[PDB]
């Protein structure tokens, strides 16, 4: 499957990604939100590829579609996103992606979820990055979560 072939070292091509990307989006557009298994393989592919091959275009599309699915109750996309955040920022830290991470974590917790908040807590726990400027709201929620975890 392309989602596993494009992850191989030096095994990526826009020729293959264009085809793979279109089948996924079409099946999604055709079968509907959270109905395309091929679209879930694309969420997964983005979660790993963007770690060592960050592309702004891919990332903005990854985040947009993940939030769409999540707004209707399908969370695998948003789960893949928080995974890319938690592990991707641990390998290569980017301030602009770190702020997106905080924004989406706040949104996830305010929607009654804890998956995102655990992944952000996990990031602070393993990256050991100190003097991180954390949004005041997210500090309060992390406090509630440390009491939980
Ligand atoms: C070792 N480790 C653990 N955590 C965190 O701490 C908690 C431990 O419980 P846990 O590990 O038992 O998670 P689960 O309950 O099984 O479910 P779940 O956590 O949902 O599953 C773990 C997922 O991580 C994903 N994973 C492993 N490596 C990678 C990677 O390189 N890239 C991406 N995008 N995902 C990865 C994998 O797909 C898997 O579904 C979990 O929240 C862990 O995430 C870590 N977080 C960071 N930032 N870095 C780490 O090295 C790390």
Which of 59, 117, 114, 50 is CA-nearest to residue 87?
Answer: 50
**Cβ contact 79:40 at 8 Å:** no
Question: Would you call 66 exposed, middle or buried from its count of C-beta atoms within 10 A (0-12, 13-18, 19+)?
Answer: buried
* Percent of residues in the chain assigned helix, strand, coil, to nearest 5: 75, 0, 25
* 45 touches ligand 1 (CB under 6 Å): no
* Cα-to-centroid distance, 113 and ligand 1 (Å): 17
The alpha carbon dihedral of 85, 88, 91, 93 has a sign of negative
Q: Which H or E run includes 77?
A: helix 76-91
* 93 touches ligand 1 (CB under 6 Å): no
- Long-range contacts made by residues 98-101, C-beta under 8 angstroms, separation at least 24? 98/132, 100/63
- What resolution in angstroms does the PDB record give? 2.3
Residue with tokens 């596993």: 4
């Amino acid at each position: 499957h392309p989602s596993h072939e494009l992850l191989k070292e030096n095994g990526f091509t826009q020729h293959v990604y264009h085809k793979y990307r279109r089948r996924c989006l079409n099946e999604r557009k055709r079968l509907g939100i959270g109905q395309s298994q091929e679209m879930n393989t694309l969420f997964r592919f983005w979660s790993y590829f963007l770690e060592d091959h960050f592309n702004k275009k891919m990332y903005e599309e990854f985040k947009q579609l993940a939030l769409e699915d999540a707004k209707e109750g399908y969370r695998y996309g948003l789960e893949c996103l928080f995974r890319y955040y938690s592990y991707g920022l641990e390998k290569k830290f980017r301030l602009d992606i770190f702020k997106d991470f905080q924004e989406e974590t706040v949104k996830d917790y305010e929607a009654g979820q804890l998956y995102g908040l655990e992944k952000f807590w996990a990031f602070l726990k393993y990256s050991k990055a100190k003097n991180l400027d954390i949004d005041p709201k997210l500090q309060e929620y992390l406090g509630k979560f440390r009491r939980l975890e």
